[PDB]
Amino acid sequence: DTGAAAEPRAPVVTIMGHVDHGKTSLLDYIRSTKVASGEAGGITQHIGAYHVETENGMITFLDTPGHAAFTSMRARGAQATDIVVLVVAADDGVMPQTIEAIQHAKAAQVPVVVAVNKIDKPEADPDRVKNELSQYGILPEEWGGESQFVHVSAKAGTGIDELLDAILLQAEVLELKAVRKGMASGAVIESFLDKGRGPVATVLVREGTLHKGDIVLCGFEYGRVRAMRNELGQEVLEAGPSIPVEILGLSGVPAAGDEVTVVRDEKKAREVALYRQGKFREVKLARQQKSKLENMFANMTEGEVHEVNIVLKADVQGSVEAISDSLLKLSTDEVKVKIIGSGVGGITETDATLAAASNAILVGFNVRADASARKVIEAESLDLRYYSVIYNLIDEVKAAMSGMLSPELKQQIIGLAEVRDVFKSPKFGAIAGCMVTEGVVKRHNPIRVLRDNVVIYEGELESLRRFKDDVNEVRNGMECGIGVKNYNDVRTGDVIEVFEI
Amino acid sequence: ANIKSAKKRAIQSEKARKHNASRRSMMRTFIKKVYAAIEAGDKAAAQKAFNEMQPIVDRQAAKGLIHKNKAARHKANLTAQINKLA
Amino acid sequence: ARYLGPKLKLSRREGTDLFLKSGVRAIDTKCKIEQAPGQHGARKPRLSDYGVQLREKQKVRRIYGVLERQFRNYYKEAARLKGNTGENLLALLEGRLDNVVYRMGFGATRAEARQLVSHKAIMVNGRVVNIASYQVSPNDVVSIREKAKKQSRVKAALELAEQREKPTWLEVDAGKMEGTFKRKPERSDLSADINEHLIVELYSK
RNA sequence: AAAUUGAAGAGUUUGAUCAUGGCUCAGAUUGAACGCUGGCGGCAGGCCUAACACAUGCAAGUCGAACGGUAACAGGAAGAAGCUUGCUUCUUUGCUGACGAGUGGCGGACGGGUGAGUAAUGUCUGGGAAACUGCCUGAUGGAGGGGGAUAACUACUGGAAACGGUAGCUAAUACCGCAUAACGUCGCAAGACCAAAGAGGGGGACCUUCGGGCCUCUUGCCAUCGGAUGUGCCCAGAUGGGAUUAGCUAGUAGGUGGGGUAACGGCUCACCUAGGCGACGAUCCCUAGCUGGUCUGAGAGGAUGACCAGCCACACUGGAACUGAGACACGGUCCAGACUCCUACGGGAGGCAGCAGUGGGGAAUAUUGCACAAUGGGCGCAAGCCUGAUGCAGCCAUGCCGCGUGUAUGAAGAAGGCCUUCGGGUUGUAAAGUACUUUCAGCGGGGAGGAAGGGAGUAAAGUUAAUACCUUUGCUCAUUGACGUUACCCGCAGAAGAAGCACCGGCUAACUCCGUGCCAGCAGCCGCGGUAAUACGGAGGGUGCAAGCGUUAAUCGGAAUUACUG
């Protein structure tokens, strides 16, 4: 990074909102692709960057879905981009997910331009959007707050001409700083694991430069680049600070996002990469000692000790950190759920072994079973379930948890009976003569013995016997007899409450 | 096949195969006629058949369909047997 | 790859002068020569049989400036060679260029001579040799190259040399700053309070 | 002259002893890993695990001097014109330098990968007799006269693709008769029978149908007997363990005859005999590629079979043959299986144990690099084209070897630290200071060798009608290096950018203080830890190694502790 060379670049733009403003539609129409609703779920659960060539100059587009679950993706996408766009619908207005995107725009000090998505529907009006978002300091219009609004059809494909112009201008009015040659650096969009290609990452390069021989260092991972891939293009020789290019040949799957810096030699970068691992490992053992010692007691003070374990491996690195945060949101005091061994991709022997030791569900956002993986899963009793969307996953884990519970709250009473004139029996130690005042008494149904409104004893009937008949059922207002084991003292005036479950 | 010439070789070897098959089937036919005469006890039919067979087991040897030694045994063997009867 | 620390410590531990300084000074006016280094130098070592063998090998190594790996390889070669192994070890050491440069008086110490060698100030047969362990042969002529000839270290080095006993197997012309390795030194040429057979014993067990 | 001329013991049972006997250590070695640390270079090594699965590129082509040929680009041309009258753009025509697709030839059986299978259609040693063998090679002769086809292409048509369907039509060194036919095959012999192909370079009278004839040389084709190399086959010995496996065997063992192979042979079939193997280990079970050699050992042995070289076996799994001199074919074919990819849903496609690279497994093993310049392989008359063989480069202290991280001087011997009986000792000539050097790294400058050849001309010989051509050998001219910023040499700047690791109770080189108090902890073996701990942890000091040092794993040694030597 020497010479202080300043060259203009294509602005990187991210788009945020409440789900359903047709945020994806804006991109696909410009891209003339329409990959929307071609994928499972009908919505975009993943992040990707796509550069297009349109007058004037060059521009690239980035998009992140807006959901309660993706706390991290929208936070990282804002700070990386020079310009942020916020989609808003006149029918939808403002929503708590959209205001969440407002904070990401201001805290990242990134200038913002917006577009009205629906001009097609007659019940949709712009004035509603402007005024209601007026209250918030963001999105002023012609009040001297320099922000500009755009009205697009998004279905009609109507300009757009204005939105595009604003974006170009907004990037034009601010000085565009970059360099064509120098020390390469940037951030990682999304990383995942491939079977043939190996571990890969999608990287935005702040300073644009690359070469097959150049050594690159991403986080605590290091390595030489074997090959370069750009979008549909299978191979690219050179990559500029503007257009994003998928990086390949790194040692292992890096963090979901971080700062990446190339180096001259790999040997010099080996010690640095190992140094970052030591710190990350030291804090890992540090946070491990605290959480265990935090209770300051050998066990839990109450009965919440019952928990459920899960095993998760997702193909993409961006999800495992992001959805886990949303997976910890569904956690409750009663039943505690925890993730064990989050994977970078697929499935493996040591992963199936991990679920073998402790009973757990093995789930993946997207995964396929390995040849060696099937043998283990099919042999021992386990469960392999893959889910296209995170919503179907977040629901069933909860379902697993709800089932875990075992509460008996009664529990409607089957019958209520009062006992009188106790008799003695060798087997049960006592037989309490009874008279059923209400309902029908049954054999295997549980009972609640109470005296003066408080419960003296509890249990389940073992023998229901009237005379020498020993009938399994006794109706109300019919003389009845009762005895139970582990009940020492029979007193008159108390009432026994039997209830079905 | 994957390589350009490998493709071509498979085509050529099939042609050769159908060529060789045809000539080879013909040859065995003319050999079999001699053994059939022998098994019926006729000198003349078997000598006659041997004379038709001779030039073609010889020729197919020259043409690489069989080796010289094979042609010779056939002539040696049949000649042995036909003489042993008449 | 070289011992760079304090030098008189080594002499003090081995109980003898190892000639690691020029000799301009009585060594006893530079250190407590007759006492080992450290808090417990005054302490006497009631020294095991292994101990005496170790220290003798260290002594020779520290004289010639050789670390263990190379010195062990020197033993191996002495052993392989014909004739007495102990004597062969000392022939090999005494044939090193850094050593020969020292004995012709071009360097005040073997350390200084070694620097002369490494820094391309020494030629063998008018050819530049810059590796210290270069084995010098009978009839070889080692010389200070023209450009290194005006170095004041060399003049001083030759003066001191003139005051040491003069080695038989070398013919040195102080004016030309060239000299001739006439022959391998005999055993009788070398100091008699070196106990090679101890070193030979250490490396056979 | 020399070339196995070589061999160590220590700790630990006991109160102590001698013996017995195991455990443990000092040593060499490693395709190593991990922990701390890490400057340069030369040479080597680098998936030991999953013969697990593989995206993408590349790893086998080449010849227009066999052939019909033009579709690309390149000129050339009657004739169209760019025309500003020698510069030219396009319409045309293979006219030719070349060359996509096609037929044809030679190579795809080599080179490269792996060790799954195999205790024997293996390997090693040593021998046999019944055989084939492309290219290269010696010998002697042929190379005559014909015939019917076909891809390409053309027309019509089906497919999403892969790839097809009709009918035309044409060439050859493709293919087949006919002749010729022995020092060949069959046969006692008499006799009977078998092949082939052209293509180029140059040219004197001579001339035509201007194609060439004809003259000449090169080269390819056919036959037969040899050489050389390769391969097939047979016998003997040796080449792991187990009896908690003792009996095994119907093509089984042999004989006759037919068939079969390139060839001997139960190789195969019919018939006949009733044999054949086995305690000198058969059968069955477990394991395994064998060797040269490698490591260790004084030796005898023990352990072992990466890297290099020889043999074998395999090529996703099971089976099969076709072509061919050679294969039952590593990037060929067919069937079945397992699996994966493409699809417009009807159908298609593929096999990294080649080189990179990916996922997976693992404590762990590299770049999707450059070049055919060199050696070597394929094709070609050559030029040349192809060559992940190979030469090189990148990565990793993985190992071996070399060198540096300065040299010399520097004393009451400072400050600080540490111990101390407060006298002093030590760190320590160490540091600071003083001169001095500049390897290596940095930066500029210059510059071997790996290069032999091949190309134009020229001259001489052998050729021949010939000074052509061809080929050989001299001559000159201009040229060919991926590595490469090469090795190496000169110059510049300044000690400047380059020291860590383990150990210090005995075995075992290296001792003190403070902290702790049978705790926290150490520990190869003995054994340390409850108030003086040289054994824990820190410090100062010291010992041993040093770009490494330790720990773990592993073979042999010591172990005369499987003892043949002993």
Swiss-Prot record, chain A:
**Which stretches does the entry tag as region G3?**
63-66
Q: Which GO terms describe its molecular function?
A: GTP binding; GTPase activity; guanosine tetraphosphate binding; ribosomal small subunit binding; translation initiation factor activity
Region annotated G1, chain positions: 17-24
The annotated consequence of residue 51 to Q reads: In strain: ECOAU9326
Q: Other remarks?
A: When overexpressed partially suppresses the slow growth and decreased 70S ribosome phenotype of an rsgA knockout; RsgA may be involved in 30S ribosomal subunit biogenesis. Silent mutations of codon 158, which no longer function as alternative start codons, decrease beta isoform expression to 31 to 50%, the strongest mutation is GUG to GUC.
**Cleaved signal peptide residues:** none
What the protein does?
One of the essential components for the initiation of protein synthesis. May protect N-formylmethionyl-tRNA(fMet) from spontaneous hydrolysis. Promotes N-formylmethionyl-tRNA(fMet) binding to the 30S pre-initiation complex (PIC). Also involved in the hydrolysis of GTP during the formation of the 70S ribosomal complex. Upon addition of the 50S ribosomal subunit, IF-1, IF-2 and IF-3 are released leaving the mature 70S translation initiation complex.
Annotated spans, 6: 288-501
Please provide the record's keywords in A-Z order.
Answer: Acetylation, Cytoplasm, GTP-binding, Initiation factor, Nucleotide-binding, Protein biosynthesis
Q: Which domain of life is it from?
A: Bacteria
Q: Which organism is it from?
A: Escherichia coli (strain K12)
- Sites binding GTP sit at 17-24, 63-67, 117-120
- Annotated region (G2) at 42-46
Question: Acetylation as a keyword?
Answer: yes
Q: Which example biological process does GO assign this protein?
A: translational initiation
Q: What family does this belong to?
A: Belongs to the TRAFAC class translation factor GTPase superfamily. Classic translation factor GTPase family. IF-2 subfamily.
Q: Which GO terms describe its cellular component?
A: cytoplasm; cytosol; membrane
Q: What is the lineage of its organism?
A: Bacteria, Pseudomonadati, Pseudomonadota, Gammaproteobacteria, Enterobacterales
Q: Where is this region: G4?
A: 117-120
Outcome of substituting residue 303 to A:
In strain: ECOAU9306
Q: tr-type G domain: from which residue to which, for each copy? A: 8-177
UniProt region (5), positions on chain: 160-287
Annotated localization: Cytoplasm
PTM N6-acetyllysine: list the residues.
Answer: 427
What name does UniProt use for this protein? Translation initiation factor IF-2
Swiss-Prot record, chain B:
One term of GO molecular function: structural constituent of ribosome
Query: What keywords appear on the UniProt entry?
Result: Ribonucleoprotein, Ribosomal protein, RNA-binding, rRNA-binding
Keyword Kinase in record: no
Q: Which GO terms describe its cellular component?
A: cytoplasm; cytosol; cytosolic small ribosomal subunit; small ribosomal subunit
Pfam families listed in its UniProt record: Ribosomal_S20p (PF01649)
- Region annotated Disordered, chain positions: 1-25
Q: GO biological process annotations for this chain's record? A: cytoplasmic translation; ribosomal small subunit assembly
Residues that span the membrane, as ranges: none
Q: What does this protein do?
A: Binds directly to 16S ribosomal RNA.
Q: Assembly state and interactors?
A: Part of the 30S ribosomal subunit.
Name the NCBIfam families for this protein: S20
Which family does this protein fall into?
Belongs to the bacterial ribosomal protein bS20 family.
Q: Kindly give the PANTHER family that the UniProt entry links to this protein.
A: 30S RIBOSOMAL PROTEIN S20, SMALL RIBOSOMAL SUBUNIT PROTEIN BS20C
Protein known as = Small ribosomal subunit protein bS20
What is the species of this protein?
Answer: Escherichia coli (strain K12)
Gene designation per UniProt: rpsT
From Swiss-Prot, chain C:
GO molecular function terms here?
mRNA 5'-UTR binding; mRNA regulatory element binding translation repressor activity; rRNA binding; structural constituent of ribosome
Pfam families, alphabetized: Ribosomal_S4, S4
Show the GO cellular component annotation of the record: cytoplasm; cytosol; cytosolic small ribosomal subunit; small ribosomal subunit
Q: Which UniProt keywords apply?
A: Antibiotic resistance, Repressor, Ribonucleoprotein, Ribosomal protein, Ribosome biogenesis, RNA-binding, rRNA-binding, Transcription, Transcription antitermination, Transcription regulation, Transcription termination, Translation regulation
Q: Which GO terms describe its biological process?
A: cytoplasmic translation; DNA-templated transcription termination; maintenance of translational fidelity; negative regulation of translational initiation; response to antibiotic; ribosomal small subunit assembly; ribosomal small subunit biogenesis; transcription antitermination
Give residue ranges for domain S4 RNA-binding: 95-155
Note whether Amino-acid biosynthesis occurs among the keywords: no
* Entries under InterPro entries matching the protein: Ribosomal_uS4, Ribosomal_uS4_bac-type, Ribosomal_uS4_CS, Ribosomal_uS4_N, S4_RNA-bd, S4_RNA-bd_sf
Q: What does this protein do?
A: One of two assembly initiator proteins for the 30S subunit, it binds directly to 16S rRNA where it nucleates assembly of the body of the 30S subunit. With S5 and S12 plays an important role in translational accuracy; many suppressors of streptomycin-dependent mutants of protein S12 are found in this protein, some but not all of which decrease translational accuracy (ram, ribosomal ambiguity mutations).
Give the record's family classification: Belongs to the universal ribosomal protein uS4 family.
Its protein name is Small ribosomal subunit protein uS4
| Species this protein is from | Escherichia coli (strain K12)
Name of the coding gene: rpsD
